[PDB]
């Protein structure tokens, strides 16, 4: 189970719905392994009339998470794979 999604508050609250949801069905899903902040620095110019001093600053992230089903039989990671998404998560899975 390798993932590709948005932020610090919708993939961690969707891999709450992966470990327990496929552990109750008989097999075992290991714990969530940390993968930190994506550190990407940007530059703009925010002045109405042009003022190279008057910049601003931005940043954007992508979280991944490493889970691994020990003996691969969990269909919940693929059947309830749309349960992992609510509005804007597009789930990547890896069966094994």
């Amino acid at each position: 189970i390798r993932l590709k999604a948005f932020d610090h508050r919708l993939i961690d609250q969707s891999t709450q719905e992966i470990v327990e949801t496929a552990k109750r069905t008989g097999a075992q899903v290991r714990g969530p392994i940390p993968l930190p902040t994506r550190k990407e620095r940007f530059t703009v110019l925010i002045s109405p009339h042009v003022n190279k001093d008057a910049r601003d600053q931005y940043e954007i992230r992508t979280h991944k998470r490493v889970l691994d089903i020990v003996q691969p039989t969990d269909k919940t990671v693929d059947a309830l794979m749309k349960l992992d998404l609510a509005a804007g998560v597009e789930v990547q899975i890896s069966l094994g």
Binding site: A5, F6, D56, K82, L85, A87, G88, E90
Partner: protein, 203 residues
């Protein structure tokens, strides 16, 4: 520096919550632009308070947050499917349409901002209903409304900073949630963008 971009987080949420690749980060940022300009220049009636363009499993999700359900929903949804065709063709992906309710609508910024500039074309005084912009919209709910009005105001070179304070608005804030709706219009001569600081309670 602009805050509402700071409280993308501890206060509020987003409107375009869809995941794609990093190269595909622009591919659904095509069609987030032909539908949002349609609700303003056509649906001045049933005023929109927020446009969320979500892309869930296999179609889309755009919720036109109106304040008038009887005009949009008419005779078992005859005008509901009208917005299905004029939008989803120019937009890339089709949309399934669901309509919610914003009962007690007198506390939101966009729901009032489209109801100020439309009265200023009919040769109405620019200082009477702006007091009753706060006197008629503060009886139940929120705690205060500051209004900066700098602008045009019937004459040519006016820099008058009107100060419609009745209550409390703090504007350095993140917990004290600021809303800000500057919709523009053109009256009998000149441009009017109505500046709005409606402010509900904290927590």
């Amino acid at each position: 520096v602009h805050p509402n971009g700071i409280r993308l987080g501890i206060v509020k949420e987003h409107t375009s919550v869809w995941y794609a690749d990093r190269k595909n980060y622009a591919d659904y940022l095509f069609a987030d632009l032909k539908v949002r300009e349609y609700l303003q220049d056509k649906l001045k009636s049933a005023s929109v308070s927020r446009i969320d363009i979500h892309r869930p499993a296999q179609t889309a999700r755009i919720t036109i947050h109106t304040a008038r359900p009887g005009i949009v929903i008419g005779k078992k949804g005859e005008d509901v499917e009208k917005l299905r065709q004029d939008l989803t063709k120019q937009m890339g992906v089709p949309v399934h349409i669901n309509i919610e309710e914003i009962r007690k609508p007198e506390l939101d910024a966009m729901l009032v901002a489209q109801s100020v500039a439309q009265q200023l074309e009919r040769r109405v005084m620019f200082r009477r209903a702006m007091k009753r912009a706060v006197q008629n919209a503060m009886r139940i709910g929120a705690k205060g409304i500051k209004i900066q009005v700098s602008g045009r105001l019937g004459g040519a070179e006016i820099a008058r900073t009107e100060w419609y304070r009745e209550g409390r608005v703090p504007l350095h804030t993140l917990r004290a949630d600021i809303d800000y709706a500057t919709y523009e219009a053109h009256t009998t001569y000149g441009v009017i963008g109505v500046k709005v600081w409606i402010f509900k309670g904290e927590v």
